mmCIF file of C-alpha atoms and ligand atoms in Angstrom:
data_model
loop_
_atom_site.group_PDB
_atom_site.id
_atom_site.type_symbol
_atom_site.label_atom_id
_atom_site.label_comp_id
_atom_site.label_asym_id
_atom_site.label_seq_id
_atom_site.Cartn_x
_atom_site.Cartn_y
_atom_site.Cartn_z
ATOM 1 C CA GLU A 2 -0.154 0.121 -0.263
ATOM 2 C CA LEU A 3 2.208 2.453 0.950
ATOM 3 C CA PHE A 4 6.166 2.347 -0.610
ATOM 4 C CA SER A 5 4.809 1.461 -3.846
ATOM 5 C CA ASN A 6 5.291 3.109 -7.263
ATOM 6 C CA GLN A 7 1.923 5.430 -6.267
ATOM 7 C CA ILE A 8 2.647 8.230 -5.004
ATOM 8 C CA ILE A 9 1.391 9.043 -1.479
ATOM 9 C CA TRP A 10 0.528 11.899 0.497
ATOM 10 C CA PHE A 11 -0.115 12.118 4.348
ATOM 11 C CA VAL A 12 -2.107 15.699 4.987
ATOM 12 C CA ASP A 13 -2.151 16.408 8.285
ATOM 13 C CA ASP A 14 -4.100 20.155 9.277
ATOM 14 C CA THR A 15 -4.150 20.178 12.819
ATOM 15 C CA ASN A 16 -1.947 22.859 12.950
ATOM 16 C CA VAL A 17 -3.250 25.386 10.656
ATOM 17 C CA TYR A 18 -5.462 27.281 12.463
ATOM 18 C CA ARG A 19 -3.642 27.983 15.847
ATOM 19 C CA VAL A 20 -4.545 30.464 18.493
ATOM 20 C CA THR A 21 -2.857 32.190 21.964
ATOM 21 C CA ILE A 22 -5.612 32.449 24.693
ATOM 22 C CA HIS A 23 -4.930 35.156 27.321
ATOM 23 C CA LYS A 24 -6.777 35.895 30.690
ATOM 24 C CA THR A 25 -6.901 39.778 30.763
ATOM 25 C CA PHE A 26 -7.024 42.067 33.767
ATOM 26 C CA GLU A 27 -10.071 42.341 33.219
ATOM 27 C CA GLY A 28 -11.231 39.161 33.546
ATOM 28 C CA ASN A 29 -11.980 37.776 30.091
ATOM 29 C CA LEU A 30 -10.257 35.620 27.304
ATOM 30 C CA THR A 31 -8.490 37.500 24.153
ATOM 31 C CA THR A 32 -8.229 34.684 21.561
ATOM 32 C CA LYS A 33 -5.178 35.801 18.809
ATOM 33 C CA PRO A 34 -4.340 33.555 15.775
ATOM 34 C CA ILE A 35 -0.960 32.805 15.290
ATOM 35 C CA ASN A 36 1.221 31.368 12.096
ATOM 36 C CA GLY A 37 0.445 28.036 11.440
ATOM 37 C CA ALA A 38 1.068 25.526 8.858
ATOM 38 C CA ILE A 39 -0.167 21.982 6.796
ATOM 39 C CA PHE A 40 1.790 19.354 6.655
ATOM 40 C CA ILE A 41 2.049 17.440 3.768
ATOM 41 C CA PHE A 42 3.893 14.192 3.421
ATOM 42 C CA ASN A 43 5.778 11.361 1.044
ATOM 43 C CA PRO A 44 6.020 8.250 3.549
ATOM 44 C CA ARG A 45 8.406 6.735 0.309
ATOM 45 C CA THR A 46 10.665 9.834 0.141
ATOM 46 C CA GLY A 47 10.456 11.207 3.326
ATOM 47 C CA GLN A 48 9.596 14.628 1.913
ATOM 48 C CA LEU A 49 7.208 17.219 3.807
ATOM 49 C CA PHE A 50 5.437 20.278 1.882
ATOM 50 C CA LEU A 51 4.924 22.738 4.797
ATOM 51 C CA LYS A 52 2.935 25.388 4.007
ATOM 52 C CA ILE A 53 3.147 28.001 6.318
ATOM 53 C CA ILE A 54 -0.168 29.736 6.816
ATOM 54 C CA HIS A 55 0.063 33.536 7.863
ATOM 55 C CA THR A 56 -2.546 35.082 10.428
ATOM 56 C CA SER A 57 -3.839 37.262 7.093
ATOM 57 C CA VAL A 58 -5.471 35.135 5.952
ATOM 58 C CA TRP A 59 -7.439 35.104 8.746
ATOM 59 C CA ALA A 60 -8.318 39.059 7.989
ATOM 60 C CA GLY A 61 -12.087 39.451 8.784
ATOM 61 C CA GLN A 62 -14.253 35.537 8.844
ATOM 62 C CA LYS A 63 -15.315 33.573 11.451
ATOM 63 C CA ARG A 64 -15.662 29.941 12.702
ATOM 64 C CA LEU A 65 -12.038 30.240 11.576
ATOM 65 C CA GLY A 66 -11.801 26.548 12.253
ATOM 66 C CA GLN A 67 -13.800 25.609 9.886
ATOM 67 C CA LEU A 68 -12.304 27.937 7.561
ATOM 68 C CA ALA A 69 -8.839 25.855 8.399
ATOM 69 C CA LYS A 70 -10.441 22.888 6.726
ATOM 70 C CA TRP A 71 -11.341 24.758 3.931
ATOM 71 C CA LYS A 72 -7.979 26.704 3.622
ATOM 72 C CA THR A 73 -5.872 23.185 4.105
ATOM 73 C CA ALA A 74 -8.025 21.883 0.914
ATOM 74 C CA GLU A 75 -7.536 25.173 -1.337
ATOM 75 C CA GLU A 76 -3.716 24.837 -0.608
ATOM 76 C CA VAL A 77 -3.317 20.644 -0.951
ATOM 77 C CA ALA A 78 -5.100 21.871 -4.584
ATOM 78 C CA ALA A 79 -2.775 24.528 -5.427
ATOM 79 C CA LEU A 80 0.440 22.501 -4.561
ATOM 80 C CA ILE A 81 -0.773 19.771 -7.115
ATOM 81 C CA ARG A 82 -1.235 22.116 -9.759
ATOM 82 C CA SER A 83 1.722 23.394 -8.973
ATOM 83 C CA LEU A 84 3.318 19.986 -10.284
ATOM 84 C CA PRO A 85 3.848 18.351 -13.197
ATOM 85 C CA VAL A 86 1.235 15.678 -13.387
ATOM 86 C CA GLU A 87 3.664 13.042 -13.070
ATOM 87 C CA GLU A 88 4.399 14.803 -9.601
ATOM 88 C CA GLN A 89 0.808 14.598 -8.152
ATOM 89 C CA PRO A 90 -0.376 11.903 -5.612
ATOM 90 C CA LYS A 91 -1.844 9.574 -7.120
ATOM 91 C CA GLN A 92 -4.136 9.159 -3.332
ATOM 92 C CA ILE A 93 -3.880 11.576 0.032
ATOM 93 C CA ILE A 94 -4.515 10.128 3.376
ATOM 94 C CA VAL A 95 -6.440 13.204 5.925
ATOM 95 C CA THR A 96 -5.371 12.572 9.405
ATOM 96 C CA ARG A 97 -8.609 14.466 10.149
ATOM 97 C CA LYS A 98 -12.062 13.204 9.043
ATOM 98 C CA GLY A 99 -13.151 17.138 9.043
ATOM 99 C CA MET A 100 -10.721 17.369 5.876
ATOM 100 C CA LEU A 101 -12.383 14.535 3.531
ATOM 101 C CA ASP A 102 -15.295 16.850 2.026
ATOM 102 C CA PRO A 103 -13.199 19.685 1.589
ATOM 103 C CA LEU A 104 -10.602 18.073 -0.453
ATOM 104 C CA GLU A 105 -13.024 16.209 -2.324
ATOM 105 C CA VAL A 106 -15.069 19.069 -3.235
ATOM 106 C CA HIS A 107 -11.552 20.487 -4.345
ATOM 107 C CA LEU A 108 -9.853 17.556 -6.305
ATOM 108 C CA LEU A 109 -13.161 17.460 -8.313
ATOM 109 C CA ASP A 110 -10.477 18.152 -11.172
ATOM 110 C CA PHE A 111 -8.576 14.859 -10.908
ATOM 111 C CA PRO A 112 -9.853 12.019 -10.978
ATOM 112 C CA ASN A 113 -7.116 9.857 -10.477
ATOM 113 C CA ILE A 114 -6.494 11.129 -7.058
ATOM 114 C CA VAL A 115 -8.271 8.986 -4.132
ATOM 115 C CA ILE A 116 -8.767 10.557 -0.929
ATOM 116 C CA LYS A 117 -9.380 8.665 2.107
ATOM 117 C CA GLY A 118 -9.740 8.680 6.228
ATOM 118 C CA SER A 119 -7.036 7.222 8.396
ATOM 119 C CA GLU A 120 -6.685 6.120 12.571
ATOM 120 C CA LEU A 121 -2.523 6.792 11.999
ATOM 121 C CA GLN A 122 -1.134 8.494 14.953
ATOM 122 C CA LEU A 123 0.536 10.454 13.092
ATOM 123 C CA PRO A 124 1.094 13.769 15.216
ATOM 124 C CA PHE A 125 3.019 16.951 12.617
ATOM 125 C CA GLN A 126 1.855 19.428 15.831
ATOM 126 C CA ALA A 127 5.376 17.374 17.709
ATOM 127 C CA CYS A 128 7.560 19.691 14.864
ATOM 128 C CA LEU A 129 6.244 22.617 16.136
ATOM 129 C CA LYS A 130 8.640 21.948 18.816
ATOM 130 C CA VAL A 131 11.252 20.888 16.825
ATOM 131 C CA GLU A 132 12.745 24.731 16.638
ATOM 132 C CA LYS A 133 13.854 24.365 12.851
ATOM 133 C CA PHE A 134 10.163 24.147 12.486
ATOM 134 C CA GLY A 135 8.792 25.940 15.146
ATOM 135 C CA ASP A 136 10.624 29.206 14.575
ATOM 136 C CA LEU A 137 10.157 29.478 10.892
ATOM 137 C CA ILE A 138 6.367 29.111 11.699
ATOM 138 C CA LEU A 139 6.292 31.679 14.304
ATOM 139 C CA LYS A 140 8.252 34.471 12.898
ATOM 140 C CA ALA A 141 6.693 34.268 9.076
ATOM 141 C CA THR A 142 5.580 37.620 7.802
ATOM 142 C CA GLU A 143 3.534 36.320 4.895
ATOM 143 C CA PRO A 144 2.925 32.707 3.546
ATOM 144 C CA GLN A 145 5.056 30.588 2.043
ATOM 145 C CA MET A 146 6.151 27.060 1.366
ATOM 146 C CA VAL A 147 8.924 25.185 2.086
ATOM 147 C CA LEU A 148 10.404 22.053 1.222
ATOM 148 C CA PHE A 149 12.403 18.969 3.764
ATOM 149 C CA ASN A 150 13.734 15.777 3.525
ATOM 150 C CA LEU A 151 12.297 14.114 7.455
ATOM 151 C CA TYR A 152 14.655 11.455 6.717
ATOM 152 C CA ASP A 153 18.083 12.616 6.351
ATOM 153 C CA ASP A 154 20.693 10.414 5.068
ATOM 154 C CA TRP A 155 18.172 7.305 6.617
ATOM 155 C CA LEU A 156 17.582 5.584 3.427
ATOM 156 C CA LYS A 157 21.223 5.773 2.351
ATOM 157 C CA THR A 158 20.877 2.255 4.562
ATOM 158 C CA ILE A 159 17.650 1.804 5.918
ATOM 159 C CA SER A 160 14.177 0.981 3.696
ATOM 160 C CA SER A 161 11.658 3.395 3.627
ATOM 161 C CA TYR A 162 8.844 1.293 5.772
ATOM 162 C CA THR A 163 11.997 1.242 8.691
ATOM 163 C CA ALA A 164 12.762 5.343 7.557
ATOM 164 C CA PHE A 165 8.913 5.952 8.551
ATOM 165 C CA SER A 166 8.702 3.767 11.604
ATOM 166 C CA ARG A 167 11.246 5.579 13.073
ATOM 167 C CA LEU A 168 9.715 8.954 12.335
ATOM 168 C CA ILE A 169 6.514 7.706 13.865
ATOM 169 C CA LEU A 170 8.068 6.352 16.550
ATOM 170 C CA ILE A 171 9.944 10.414 17.194
ATOM 171 C CA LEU A 172 6.545 12.398 16.751
ATOM 172 C CA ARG A 173 4.631 10.560 18.733
ATOM 173 C CA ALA A 174 7.207 10.478 21.917
ATOM 174 C CA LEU A 175 7.746 14.305 21.125
ATOM 175 C CA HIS A 176 3.516 14.281 21.084
ATOM 176 C CA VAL A 177 3.560 12.637 24.373
ATOM 177 C CA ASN A 178 6.603 13.817 26.362
ATOM 178 C CA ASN A 179 8.915 16.379 24.373
ATOM 179 C CA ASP A 180 11.183 16.639 26.869
ATOM 180 C CA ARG A 181 12.237 13.007 27.872
ATOM 181 C CA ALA A 182 12.016 12.405 23.796
ATOM 182 C CA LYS A 183 14.176 15.245 23.635
ATOM 183 C CA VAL A 184 16.602 13.623 25.898
ATOM 184 C CA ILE A 185 16.007 10.593 24.548
ATOM 185 C CA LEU A 186 17.256 11.380 21.329
ATOM 186 C CA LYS A 187 20.585 13.255 22.572
ATOM 187 C CA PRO A 188 22.513 9.999 24.116
ATOM 188 C CA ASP A 189 25.611 11.610 24.631
ATOM 189 C CA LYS A 190 27.378 15.286 25.179
ATOM 190 C CA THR A 191 28.682 15.046 21.367
ATOM 191 C CA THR A 192 25.645 13.859 19.782
ATOM 192 C CA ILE A 193 24.508 16.783 16.780
ATOM 193 C CA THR A 194 21.701 17.188 14.074
ATOM 194 C CA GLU A 195 23.466 18.756 10.746
ATOM 195 C CA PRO A 196 22.500 21.908 10.222
ATOM 196 C CA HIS A 197 20.382 20.652 7.308
ATOM 197 C CA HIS A 198 19.047 17.676 9.236
ATOM 198 C CA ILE A 199 16.475 17.496 11.132
ATOM 199 C CA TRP A 200 17.282 14.630 13.212
ATOM 200 C CA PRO A 201 20.747 13.901 15.319
ATOM 201 C CA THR A 202 23.195 12.171 13.682
ATOM 202 C CA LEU A 203 23.359 8.336 14.962
ATOM 203 C CA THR A 204 25.163 5.254 14.858
ATOM 204 C CA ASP A 205 22.688 1.882 13.774
ATOM 205 C CA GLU A 206 23.026 1.124 17.634
ATOM 206 C CA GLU A 207 21.991 4.201 19.138
ATOM 207 C CA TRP A 208 19.293 3.923 16.598
ATOM 208 C CA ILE A 209 17.996 0.335 17.892
ATOM 209 C CA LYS A 210 18.330 1.958 21.714
ATOM 210 C CA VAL A 211 16.297 5.243 20.736
ATOM 211 C CA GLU A 212 13.973 3.381 19.136
ATOM 212 C CA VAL A 213 12.880 0.920 21.838
ATOM 213 C CA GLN A 214 12.545 3.955 24.644
ATOM 214 C CA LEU A 215 10.922 5.803 21.969
ATOM 215 C CA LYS A 216 8.350 3.152 21.735
ATOM 216 C CA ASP A 217 8.529 2.691 25.566
ATOM 217 C CA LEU A 218 7.996 6.224 26.346
ATOM 218 C CA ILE A 219 4.653 6.103 23.825
ATOM 219 C CA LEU A 220 3.767 2.970 25.838
ATOM 220 C CA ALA A 221 3.515 4.675 29.042
ATOM 221 C CA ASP A 222 1.917 7.358 28.020
HETATM 222 CL CL1 LIG B 301 -11.848 16.351 12.059
HETATM 223 CL CL1 LIG B 302 9.716 0.048 2.623
HETATM 224 CL CL1 LIG B 303 0.823 9.870 19.798
#
C-alpha cells in the first residue's frame, strides 16, 4: 500500500488554525491567531511540503476552525496544480476526517486522486517544538512553502518502511513527552544534528536503543 509505485501524501491540517488564549486584567479571554502550517508528507521519500499559514489569511472571517479545513483543501489543490502531472499524488490520506469533504470538493478536476481518512497517529504537531520548524512558522510574515527531507540520510542504509516507522516513533514520543523524548534523542554530550538535517546523527546501535526507548515512552503515555 504505502511504498509502491503510487505517490502517496499524508495531509495533516491540525496545525493550520492556531491561537493564543489569554485572561486579561479585566477577566475576559482574548483569543489571538498565530501562524500555522499544513504538513503534506510523502512516506516513501520523506519529502515534506510545509505550507506556512500566516495569520493575515483569517482577517475578517469567523468560525476559523471550520474555515481552516477549507483553506487546507485550497492549498493542497494549489500545490497539486503547481506540480507536473507525474509528480501529483495518486492517494491522499488525511489524518483528520474533517478534511474529507473539503478535499473532495476541491479536487474534482483530479479524478485519478483517491482521498481517504486514517486512524493512524501521526502527530506532525510535534514538529512545532522542533526549533527549525517552530521558529520558521512563528516568525513568518507572509505565507510560503518550504521543502524538507524528514528522513535525513537514513535511506542510504534503511528502507522507506523502516524510516517511516522511526519517524512516527519520534513524532509520537515528542508529542507525548517532548522533554524526555529530546533526552532520548541526545544520548551523548557530543550528539549533534547537522544544520540541514532535522534529526540527530546517531550510529545504528544508538538508533536501536532510541527506537525502543521512544516506543516505551509512547506506551507509558
Ligand atoms: Cl476533524
Ligand atoms: Cl520499503
Ligand atoms: Cl501519539
